[PDB]
Amino acid sequence: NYSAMIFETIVDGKLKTEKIFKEINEHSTSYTFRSEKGLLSATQFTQPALTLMEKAAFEDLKSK
Amino acid sequence: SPTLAGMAQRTLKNKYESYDAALSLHREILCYSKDAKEIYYTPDPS
Numbered sequence: 001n002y003s004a005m006i007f008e009t010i011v012d013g014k015l016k017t018e019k020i021f022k023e024i025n026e027h028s029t030s031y032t033f034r035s036e037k038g039l040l041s042a043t044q045f046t047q048p049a050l051t052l053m054e055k056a057a058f059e060d061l062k063s064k
Numbered sequence: 065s066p067t068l069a070g071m072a073q074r075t076l077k078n079k080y081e082s083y084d085a086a087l088s089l090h091r092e093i094l095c096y097s098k099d100a101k102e103i104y105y106t107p108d109p110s
Binding site (some may be wrong): 016054061064 | 096103104
């Protein structure tokens with residue numbers, strides 16, 4: 001599920017279907033997320049949390 | 065945080081002075097985090 005992630009950046013010539021997490025292969029055992037302060041402010045964590053909080057808030061109001 | 069509340073609040077301050085009064089239109093600006101009691105309708109006894 002980490003492998004199959006893709007993106008497309010312009011690299012000097014043309015488009016490129018390069019994958020995220022170049023380290024992760026079929027022989028990888030660990031991957032590590034590194035921050036300076038905390039993972040909460042690294043935007044692949046910020047974004048879902050923010051989204052959840054708001055949806056959660058809404059469903060409470062919908063229940064009421 | 066009330067980011068968009070502020071953005072809405074100050075947009076009405078700028079160019080909706082003449083328009084809101086013209087319709088007798090009362091406006092209510094609410095954030096979830098701050099203005100919980102008005103949205104949940106659960107004020108204190110007071």
